[PDB]
Amino acid sequence: QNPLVYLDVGADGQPLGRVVLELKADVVPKTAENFRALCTGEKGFGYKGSTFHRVIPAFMCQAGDFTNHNGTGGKSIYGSRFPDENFTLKHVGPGVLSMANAGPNTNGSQFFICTIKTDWLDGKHVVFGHVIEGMDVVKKIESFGSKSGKTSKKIVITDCGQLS
């Protein structure tokens, strides 16, 4: 079964709610497993207490940097970086869960949740899931973003884990 994970997000210490995500382990097992383990924190590290450092309205909300909290860091459960599994899944619309990177085969822990069809990213970024529930919470995160990416409020992942 494809894992069902959660992100509990807060803005300036005030809760925004829960984002439930389905991880397509049936298409991208290695990419899904990396994100699932970072939600539980079973490897001794992960998303708990980390932030959405770059948020651009009408585009995406970016997070995953649990090491430096500014886009310069983060690491995978396999090592520093891991290869691009495949580009089978496309950035078809809002709610798409995809890996941020620094070029080909540089996947770590940084990901993004789309707020629009980001089809110009197809073949460059690994899509590994989608929002099941809490798109209203994603839109709340989006409202705290700006054209530069700078957030108007500290967007923190207060809790995260696996539902099934």
Binding site: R54, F59, G71, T72, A100, N101, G108, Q110
Partner: peptide
């Protein structure tokens, strides 16, 4: 521009 990168953020 509209990218999602980790290290050298581009326009």
């Amino acid at each position: 521009x509209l990218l999602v990168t980790a290290x050298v953020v581009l326009a």
